[PDB]
Write a protein that binds this ligand. Structure first.
Ligand SMILES: O=C(O)[C@@](O)(COP(=O)(O)O)[C@H](O)[C@H](O)COP(=O)(O)O
Ligand SMILES: O=C(O)[C@@](O)(COP(=O)(O)O)[C@H](O)[C@H](O)COP(=O)(O)O
Ligand SMILES: O=C(O)[C@@](O)(COP(=O)(O)O)[C@H](O)[C@H](O)COP(=O)(O)O
Ligand SMILES: [Mg+2]
Ligand SMILES: [Mg+2]
Ligand SMILES: [Mg+2]
Lengths: 469, 122, 469, 351, 118
């Protein structure tokens, strides 16, 4: 006759419902690893519970409506908390989310729960999402990349080496006719691809359709001249979905094999739509990660790039920028090798030494081609081939358009350097150790390469790393 | 636990959840209009439905009026001419071009579709 | 007959082209204020110049193609650098961008240039975009908010007080039928609005269309019962643009007055499309800022919320969450007052004590209604009315569905508290000082409010602020 | 507690509200210069003020609704009046219009305010709109020309000289087959372009689609024979928007590089639509100014061509007829040089 | 030619267009307007309505009374060209809304030399 659990109004600790250290995670749960910095006086268990609660089913005071459903079934659960070595006030809090919490095929929805509100809670000083375990049952609800690495290579008929690309420069300020001029001269020297700069959309100095048309002429001319398949990533990034689609439709009409999208500044909702359009029309889709470092640079707060990369893989992209390690933008070697594996491979085992917090099973979702771009030149080539292997695209914007003899020589220098390194590797040479010798020999042989070797001989980018494991 | 009644419990926007406004309380609202330089206006209607945007204007908005007594006299005049009508006092801000305040100063006496404050829950 | 400036291959300092401390800014320039932390050995002028260059026209080495156009015309310019008081290695770098750099009407494009790549440069340790000066000539290229504050009040026929809302809880796990049940009980007690939780989209426990139908019934019943216009922000946030539009179209067909969108997790491209649809169909558009704290929490790195707010105003939204100051999520008073003005007002003068780095002229673009939401209850009411004034919506989720007598009494308590504070203010009472007295009197008069007063009496959220000026 | 400015019914002088000689113009204001001829007994200040009022917020008697808004914020302002040298009853009245008065991207709307009613006021004898200052903040709201000079040269691959064209004759009365015959023979001799006459649309002697097909054959044959890029401006001018668009769509399908439109007889609303279509489909757009002289010939009354040219630039066109100075139609040298700069250049100083 | 009609015009049953008389007119103009246009016209009073001292509804009423009084008088055989003032004066005495309009605009006329002469 006595009452069981009833509705009791008022505030109680989150940990009473949301800290479940004995929980056995299910194979369909989405798991998150948060690097959490609590405010003084807030127990890590309460902090972890608050994060779990307010990214799943809970709010700040008890609600009677819980009783109409089953909180056990739906609640997010902080199931484990480990202190971080070398830190007095940082913890990795592990949270498990039932698969029922998430809209099928929606990266937008997954981010909204997991990173929606919790980063702003007063009770914490900093929060960083380090990793997510996307279970096969959720992965299967996504269309995923339009093609993926293997299909891409088959569509381009290109095998046995890294792909070569190049951003046209200056970033902004060139007319459509000059854009196509630069593109033709770049492609005809041996680059597989050129591209619009991330911020080249449609502007007073160059309207998009004018560009698309001149670039298509340039692609066609360079392909006919060299006898090799060429492409140029035409930018579909736009202010609205309708404008985005108009651009992709025009690229398709022109028969150009590849377009690009800035997935973070455009957004996951637009990006998913575009990936689906690309799948439906056989367009390759290059993804630029503009804005990622606003989110992923600092160790103590934000979202690690590996999570942004997993999210892109799910939303859809054939290429995604991966950093260069050795170029002008940050990316530590081990961190990079970790997320490169997460982007390309089907199954990646947990490996904390590479920032992989969870074993990730992609259940045959296609792999995304990493693109190394930004401040790299011919002397970096051996290191790049060593880091990425063949399944990558290596991009030289300044490293092409900055060649003293112009674009076609600049392209040829990069292509010779890539092929020399590739051959050397295939022959058993250790690029990590003998890379300088491979390039030096190639410089002596090729006058185009020699000219590049001389100009950028002293140029290195070596700085203290912010995003450290 | 008291139960909020669904029966004849109609409300009329700003201040309807408070005790009925006294003459002193209405006067204080009018002072607030004047102190802020807003334009007082009266509006009235036979019926009040949430779907119905417009009521009938009493005369014209009192442009340039800085005298609370003048506003209170127009309330008396409007309610005298329409003793069975809903009547509301509103004020306009011409800079933002929007109504900036408003509340009922009369309801029909034949109306039994709302509750006294202490009869809103059972 | 000497040679003028020619093409010289190789790397030179960015400052030689991109640091222009004598530049007089034009009235059509977009201005940015970056809080910049250089790596050791990188002069602040070179750091600011690098940021200006790589967010406008420049790359890491000299390119011959500059000569085909006019760099003077198009280059971004670091035109001023000030040291930050109390910091040995922080500077505010001011960058001017010519209006020609930007695609008309595209927040996506603006962000892509200004925050696209620069935050990841090895040569800096941290970067934070603090403010942007959006010139009237650029503002004018945007549709902007579907309605804005004045038009919204006219469409709701609601005047003379703050609006009152409420997120249904638990966040996830309720059926469509139970959602509508909760919504009806909430609205009938005196709330103007309820809403889907930001992460309530479409899920196995509740499909969106089932929800939309039940919520429409609930709105209609509460409106008929109370005699006051009611709404509920039905969530159009989705995985693709097509799904998002489907949801908006259904809400329109149902004749519900308002929907919501998560602009950052959905993205600017989707958001702008949705805003335009809302303008074209008379739908009010509530914006949830899910994910903003990932970006905007830390003082040293990211984008300040005021910039994310300006960007939303441009992309389009009738409401935008502004924080509460006093609730469960962070938001310092002066910071908040500053961006609230930037959201609502037509013209906001530079005011560094409120974090306003530039005078902002919105040239009649509609104002966005601030929404104060998150861990607030009846005792906060005087502070909320004092901070925000009437042009705000105040939301009580837990503060309604956590009331010991259920939703209608909870709503009634909040509505009585708001009305008593409003009346008291109008009467000349100082809410900052006498707020407690206003609530105490109201508690004694209204049994519904009294019950709320008792349960939450002790509950405060007071923590050290991270996002400090 | 004494009353402020209230509503007073009745007529008062426009100058009391609309003549503001101390007003400092804002960089976002649209400015107009009206050549104004007042009736005898009408002070120029009242005449200028009437023009400003009835092209912005005002009417002939005081309305109570002004009080609901801010007339200061919205009113047009006659801010300066200069006498015209050599005239006893002509003045240039300068009027400033706040940017909020105008619909974004709509030349139609701008004309409706500025030239809508004021030219028929009994209180004036003549009115001519001489010039408009279109501020960058308003300019930015327009798509503008589909391509413009530099893009057009790049699309034609033509550089280093004037382009050469030619209207087919007789104006009307040729069959489609003879039209294409004439076109081919013209283009093959060294002209870059030929064109439909402004009034060649679709008619009993020659239906449009028949012409478009024959002309496309002629363009192709001449281009193959000469080795130079050829075009012919096919006329999309029509009785309805739907017919206009049908014609543009057919030209696009044929792959012809250029079409034409009569912007004044077709109208700004149609013209803007067409320009947008031409932008979205890479079609060059030649603009014929048919009917302009009805408006712009007389010194004392109408709208100067320079304003009609600015309006076309905003609405959208790749070409616009400018006059010849030396040919059969009027166009004084200095006047022409001025509006040619206004048509082509980015920044043109007062002169 | 005395009305500027240079050619006989046959419209072959194409529908007629309703003339709209608008711009600076008020209650005292009503008889002249009814006399010039007859019934097949729309007569528009913007300032002549929103400029009424009692607001829009009284303004509208004044205009509607004036139109109806003129129409009735015409139907009764009265010559509006000659007795139009008398019709308005009678109506002003009867209708307080109209009287207020009559007073405010009593002196107001627009008489200038014509540019567009035959
Ligand atoms: O805009 C640029 O700087 C680039 O075009 C590189 O130009 P260069 O080839 O001349 O360096 C790439 O977009 C960046 O690499 C993006 O950075 P990331 O790949 O790290 O996202
Ligand atoms: O999920 C939540 O916590 C809320 O529904 C509030 O619920 P309660 O009313 O029960 O607290 C709001 O979405 C947050 O306030 C968003 O944060 P912000 O407004 O800062 O963006
Ligand atoms: O803008 C105006 O002045 C009017 O609204 C009249 O206002 P009022 O009723 O206040 O006079 C009409 O549009 C003019 O009659 C147009 O002139 P017309 O009829 O000659 O074409
Ligand atoms: Mg780039
Ligand atoms: Mg929420
Ligand atoms: Mg001709």
């Amino acid at each position: 006759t006595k009452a069981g659990a009833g509705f009791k109004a008022g505030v109680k600790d989150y940990r009473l419902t949301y800290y479940t250290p004995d929980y056995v995670v299910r194979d369909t749960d989405i798991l998150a690893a948060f690097r959490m910095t609590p405010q003084p006086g807030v127990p890590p268990e309460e902090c972890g519970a608050a994060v779990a609660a307010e990214s799943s089913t809970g709010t700040w005071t008890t609600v009677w409506t819980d009783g109409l459903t089953s909180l056990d079934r739906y609640k997010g659960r902080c199931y484990d908390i480990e202190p971080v070595p070398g830190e007095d006030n940082q913890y990795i809090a592990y949270v498990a989310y039932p698969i029922d919490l998430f809209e099928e095929g929606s990266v937008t929805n997954m981010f909204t729960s997991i990173v929606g509100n919790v980063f702003g809670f007063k009770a914490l000083r900093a929060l960083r999402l380090e990793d997510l375990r996307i279970p096969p049952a959720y992965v299967k609800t996504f269309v995923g990349p339009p093609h993926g690495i293997q299909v891409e290579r088959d569509k381009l008929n290109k095998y046995g080496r890294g792909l070569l690309g190049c951003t046209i420069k200056p970033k902004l300020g060139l007319s459509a006719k000059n854009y196509g001029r630069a593109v033709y001269e770049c492609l005809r020297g041996g680059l597989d691809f050129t591209k619009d700069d991330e911020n080249v959309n449609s502007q007073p100095f160059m309207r998009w359709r004018d560009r698309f048309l001149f670039v298509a002429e340039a692609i066609y001319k360079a392909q006919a001249e060299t006898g090799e398949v060429k492409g140029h990533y035409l930018n579909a990034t736009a202010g609205t979905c309708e404008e985005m689609m108009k651009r992709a439709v025009c690229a398709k009409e022109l028969g150009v094999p590849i377009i690009m999208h800035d997935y973070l500044t455009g957004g996951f909702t637009a990006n998913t739509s575009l990936a689906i359009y690309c799948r439906d029309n056989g367009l390759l889709l290059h993804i630029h990660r503009a804005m990622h470092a606003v989110i992923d640079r600092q160790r103590n707060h934000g979202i690690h790039f590996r999570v942004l990369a997993k999210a892109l893989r799910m939303s859809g992209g054939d290429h995604l920028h991966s950093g260069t390690v050795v170029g002008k933008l940050e990316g530590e070697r081990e961190v990079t090798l970790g997320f490169v594996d997460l982007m390309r491979d089907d199954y990646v085992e947990k490996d904390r030494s590479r920032g992989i917090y969870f074993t990730q099973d992609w259940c045959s979702m296609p792999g995304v081609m990493p693109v190394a771009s930004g401040g790299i030149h011919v002397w970096h080539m051996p290191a790049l081939v060593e880091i990425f292997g063949d399944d990558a695209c290596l991009q030289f914007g300044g490293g092409t358009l900055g060649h003293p003899w112009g674009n076609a020589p600049g392209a040829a220098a990069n292509r010779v350097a890539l092929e020399a390194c590739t051959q050397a590797r295939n022959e058993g040479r250790d690029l990590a150790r003998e890379g300088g010798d491979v390039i030096r020999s190639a410089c002596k042989w090729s006058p185009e390469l020699a000219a590049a070797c001389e100009v950028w001989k002293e140029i290195k980018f070596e700085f203290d790393t912010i995003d450290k494991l | 636990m008291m139960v909020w009644t669904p029966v004849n419990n109609k409300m009329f926007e700003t201040f309807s959840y408070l005790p009925p406004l006294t003459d002193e309380q209405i006067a204080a609202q009018v002072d607030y209009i004047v102190a802020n330089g807003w334009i007082p206006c009266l509006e009235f209607a036979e019926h009040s439905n949430p779907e119905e945007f417009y009521w009938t204007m009493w005369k014209l908005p009192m442009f340039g009026c800085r005298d609370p007594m003048q506003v209170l006299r127009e309330i008396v005049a409007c309610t005298k001419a329409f003793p069975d009508a809903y009547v509301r006092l509103v004020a306009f801000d011409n800079q933002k071009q929007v109504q900036i305040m408003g509340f009922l100063v009369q309801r029909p006496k034949t109306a039994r579709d709302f509750q006294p404050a202490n009869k809103r829950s059972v």
